[PDB]
């Protein structure tokens, strides 16, 4: 179906402890495929998925130089941002950037992104038009004015509509064994007595890929949203993800509760009950 390629970047200053640490990872969908960490002994962009390993030395050299250059500009940016916010040089601060592209089943651009956050807060974002900016505050407006003057958006649009989409197409083909396989959840319901009056029913989804999933409890056909504990979807470490949803069930009511599972690896949504 549809797919995404995203690059994530974080620089964290550490005054008195050297230069800011820079870490960047790239994903296709929910698959990590490259990483770079300036604190590695010999920083290089490194492969993290089998289908990128076939890229040749020129790819790794070029990607590594991009990463090193971004580490350097982020360090200049962190100095700039202290000025923009009238901050002291004494504290640690954070600069985050994400960019990339979403494509449909036919491979055409659906949406592009390029956005920054400073100290965990939105700073400046390229709008969906790939042509104008949303600045969060008067500091980010200074950046916006510089980027408008330099026609930065036009350069980003060209990457996001061109190279971004073409790389994603290549990766999806080279990785077609995995990137184009959905692993459905393995599902079951467990029962966990609390007291004589009530028990937890926990609906599990295990071993699934990609991470997107919907997992809901109904009672007598009514969604139990306010009364459901839904944990964040979590990595298993074998590419797959896990999730559970739990409800507190009065004694003897178990058969009134149904768990509902939606995942793109399932041809049809599942309904499950506790099976004593």
């Amino acid at each position: 179906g549809s797919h995404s390629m995203r690059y994530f970047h974080t620089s964290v200053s550490r005054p008195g402890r050297g230069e800011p640490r820079f870490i960047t990872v790239g994903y296709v969908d929910d698959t990590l495929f490259v990483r770079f960490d300036s604190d590695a002994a010999s920083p290089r962009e490194e492969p993290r998925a089998p289908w990128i390993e076939q890229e040749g030395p020129e790819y790794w050299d070029r990607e590594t130089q991009i990463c090193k250059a971004k580490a350097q500009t982020d360090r200049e940016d962190l100095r700039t941002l202290l000025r923009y916010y009238n901050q002291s040089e004494a504290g640690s601060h954070t600069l985050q950037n994400m960019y990339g592209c979403d494509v449909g089943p036919d491979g055409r651009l659906l949406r592009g992104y390029h956005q920054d956050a400073y100290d965990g807060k939105d700073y400046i974002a390229l709008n969906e038009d790939l042509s104008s900016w949303t600045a969060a505050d008067t500091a980010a407006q200074i950046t916006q004015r510089k980027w408008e003057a330099a026609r930065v958006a036009e350069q980003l649009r060209a990457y996001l509509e061109g190279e971004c989409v073409e790389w994603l197409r290549r990766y999806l083909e080279n990785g077609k064994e995995t990137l184009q396989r959905a692993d459905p959840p393995k599902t079951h319901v467990t029962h966990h007595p609390i007291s004589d009056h009530e028990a937890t029913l926990r609906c599990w989804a295990l071993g699934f890929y990609p991470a997107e999933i919907t997992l809901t409890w109904q009672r007598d056909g009514e969604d139990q949203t306010q009364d459901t504990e839904l944990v964040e979807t979590r990595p298993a470490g074998d590419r797959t993800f896990q999730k559970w949803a739990a409800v507190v069930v009065p004694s003897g009511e178990e058969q009134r509760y149904t768990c509902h599972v939606q995942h793109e690896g399932l041809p049809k949504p599942l309904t499950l009950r506790w099976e004593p």
Partner: peptide, 9 residues
């Protein structure tokens, strides 16, 4: 493959 266009805030 990455964006190769240095940008400064």
């Amino acid at each position: 493959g990455r964006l190769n266009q240095p940008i400064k805030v």
